[PDB]
Amino acid sequence: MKNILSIQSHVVFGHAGNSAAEFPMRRMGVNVWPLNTVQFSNHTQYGHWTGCVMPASHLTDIVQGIADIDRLKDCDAVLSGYIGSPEQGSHILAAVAQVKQANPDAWYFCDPVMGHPEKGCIVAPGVAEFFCNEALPASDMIAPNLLELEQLSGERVENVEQAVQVARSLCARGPKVVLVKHLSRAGYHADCFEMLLVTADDAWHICRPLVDFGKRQPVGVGDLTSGLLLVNLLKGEPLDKALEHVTAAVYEVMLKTQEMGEYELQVVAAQETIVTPICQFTAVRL
Amino acid sequence: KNILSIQSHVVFGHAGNSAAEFPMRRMGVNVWPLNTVQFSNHTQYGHWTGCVMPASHLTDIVQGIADIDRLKDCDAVLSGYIGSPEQGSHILAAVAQVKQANPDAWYFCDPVMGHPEKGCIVAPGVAEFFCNEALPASDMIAPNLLELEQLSGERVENVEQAVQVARSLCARGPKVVLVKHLSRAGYHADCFEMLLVTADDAWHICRPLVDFGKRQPVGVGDLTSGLLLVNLLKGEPLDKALEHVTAAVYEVMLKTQEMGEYELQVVAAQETIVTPICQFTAVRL
Numbered sequence: 001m002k003n004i005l006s007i008q009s010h011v012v013f014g015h016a017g018n019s020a021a022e023f024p025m026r027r028m029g030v031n032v033w034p035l036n037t038v039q040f041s042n043h044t045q046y047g048h049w050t051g052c053v054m055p056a057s058h059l060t061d062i063v064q065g066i067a068d069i070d071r072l073k074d075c076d077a078v079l080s081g082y083i084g085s086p087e088q089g090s091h092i093l094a095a096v097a098q099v100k101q102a103n104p105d106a107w108y109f110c111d112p113v114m115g116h117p118e119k120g121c122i123v124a125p126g127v128a129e130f131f132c133n134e135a136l137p138a139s140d141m142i143a144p145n146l147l148e149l150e151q152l153s154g155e156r157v158e159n160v161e162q163a164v165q166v167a168r169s170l171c172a173r174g175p176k177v178v179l180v181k182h183l184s185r186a187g188y189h190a191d192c193f194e195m196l197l198v199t200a201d202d203a204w205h206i207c208r209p210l211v212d213f214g215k216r217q218p219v220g221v222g223d224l225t226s227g228l229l230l231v232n233l234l235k236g237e238p239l240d241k242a243l244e245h246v247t248a249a250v251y252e253v254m255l256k257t258q259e260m261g262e263y264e265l266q267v268v269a270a271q272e273t274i275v276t277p278i279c280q281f282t283a284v285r286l
Numbered sequence: 287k288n289i290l291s292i293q294s295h296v297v298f299g300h301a302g303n304s305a306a307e308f309p310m311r312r313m314g315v316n317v318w319p320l321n322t323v324q325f326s327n328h329t330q331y332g333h334w335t336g337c338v339m340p341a342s343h344l345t346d347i348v349q350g351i352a353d354i355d356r357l358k359d360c361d362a363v364l365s366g367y368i369g370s371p372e373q374g375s376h377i378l379a380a381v382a383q384v385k386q387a388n389p390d391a392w393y394f395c396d397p398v399m400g401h402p403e404k405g406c407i408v409a410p411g412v413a414e415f416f417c418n419e420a421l422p423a424s425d426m427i428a429p430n431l432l433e434l435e436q437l438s439g440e441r442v443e444n445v446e447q448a449v450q451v452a453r454s455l456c457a458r459g460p461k462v463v464l465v466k467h468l469s470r471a472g473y474h475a476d477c478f479e480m481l482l483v484t485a486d487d488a489w490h491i492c493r494p495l496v497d498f499g500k501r502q503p504v505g506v507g508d509l510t511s512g513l514l515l516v517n518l519l520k521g522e523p524l525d526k527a528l529e530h531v532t533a534a535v536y537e538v539m540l541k542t543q544e545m546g547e548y549e550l551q552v553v554a555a556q557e558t559i560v561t562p563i564c565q566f567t568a569v570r571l
């Protein structure tokens with residue numbers, strides 16, 4: 001069994017962060033050690049929530065506890081997404097460093113969440129700086145959307161050719177794999193959702209139809225995309241097959257959500273189409 | 287169907303919510319995991335790191351779900367191991383608030399106190415909490431032989447006595463009693479046995495004993511309790527509900543044993559949770 005230490009938010013009702021990624025990743029047959037950074041009643045896009053943020057020192061305490069039972073060496077990858085403060089981020093990188101000492105083959109998959117290209121930045125002060133100068137150099141894979149790829153590089157990205165080159169420039173600072181999870185305006189077609197998977201030797205481009213949720217877009221699509229890519233890569237899937245599975249599995253969860261008229265991403269109702277999607281999307285090697 | 291599950295969370299391994307959440311979601315029921323603690327691993331390792339959530343955090347979370355008008359979607363509240371009477375009283379306040387939002391909601395109480403062979407493991411305040419407070423508020427309970435004797439104050443020597451004592455606990459609140467581990471009160475020392483009791487009927491079931499040596503895997507009771515609530519919420523007949531739970535838990539224990547693991551292998555055994563290969567037949571008494 002492959003084992004992921006996933007350090008993300010937890011919501012009691014609904015799905016976001018670890019609450020969006022844990023059940024789909026376990027459904028695919030990979031273990032998830034869910035190290036919850038918060039415990040909130042619901043995600044923040046309802047405009048109100050109750051609960052609490054865990055002390056940043058709690059995150060490194062947990063990791064020490066797993067090392068104390070000599071199980072930290074079983075961790076094959078660390079996954080991070082939304083980060084509420086630079087202090088929390090520094091403790092997540094301390095967890096990554098501790099895991100790699102116990103297991104030198106462990107990967108750090110960083111979703112550098114900063115916001116949606118259509119809405120703008122939603123991160124707390126200092127978090128953008130933390131991703132650019134701290135998380136990026138320590139990462140083995142990163143999954144920036146267009147807004148995050150531009151923030152991390154400090155460059156405008158206008159098309160796929162540029163996105164590949166800019167992704168390869170971020171790679172030189174640390175990660176070996178870059179997933180441009182949301183191309184946005186830099187894509188080929190305005191009527192299509194697009195993603196790009198980049199390595200040193202290759203780049204794959206993939207397309208799928210847009211899902212119009214209108215005013216209330218469900219939270220967790222990025223969290224699910226990042227988590228499912230990590231699972232496919234840990235399971236030894238070729239990069240093109242990995243991208244194709246993620247693209248179709250996420251799309252099917254989104255369709256199920258819209259069909260049920262729900263605001264929350266329906267990760268449990270769509271579980272059969274997560275492992276075996278009906279929809280098939282094919283990547284194009286650039 | 288939606289379950290608000292208020293139990294422990296362990297980052298590595300499986301106990302409490304970490305044992306029950308994935309299997310119940312695998313069965314197609316939603317789980318709202320209200321974690322009472324966040325620990326590095328369960329306490330039977332003999333050491334752990336992490337913390338206990340403040341008891342007021344539990345009722346704070348329930349209010350937040352009521353604030354988004356979603357508490358009415360809750361079909362059941364599930365509880366297991368409780369660390370203190372204070373945590374316990376906040377769990378019952380959560381149950382009362384859910385029942386106000388949804389009068390058809392059930393409270394499933396696993397009254398954990400200890401193992402019938404290893405003995406009690408909770409403070410006496412917690413045993414008093416289950417007898418005085420948790421039992422009158424429950425709709426279903428899943429005591430092992432030790433817990434069934436603690437709640438009734440009577441010695442239970444056999445299945446006939448177990449059925450009578452279970453119905454005596456029902457007059458005190460619950461409509462369904464699962465004697466999750468019969469222990470010495472069972473018919474056969476060589477069999478693992480359980481009993482499902484209602485006002486009109488009682489079902490008995492057996493399955494082989496699984497030998498794990500000195501280190502007994504944690505969470506068997508948590509998984510049993512969780513999977514029974516799922517079967518009842520999905521409207522399974524009581525005999526079919528007992529048969530599925532008995533076989534699905536056994537399959538998880540078989541997978542754990544064949545892998546030589548200490549942790550209950552709830553993810554590796556996921557295919558046999560929904561569709562067990564083993565078949566065990568319940569007998570109506």
Ligand code: NA
Nearest residue numbers: 187189190192
């Ligand atoms: Na596009």
Ligand code: NA
Nearest residue numbers: 472474475477
């Ligand atoms: Na027996």
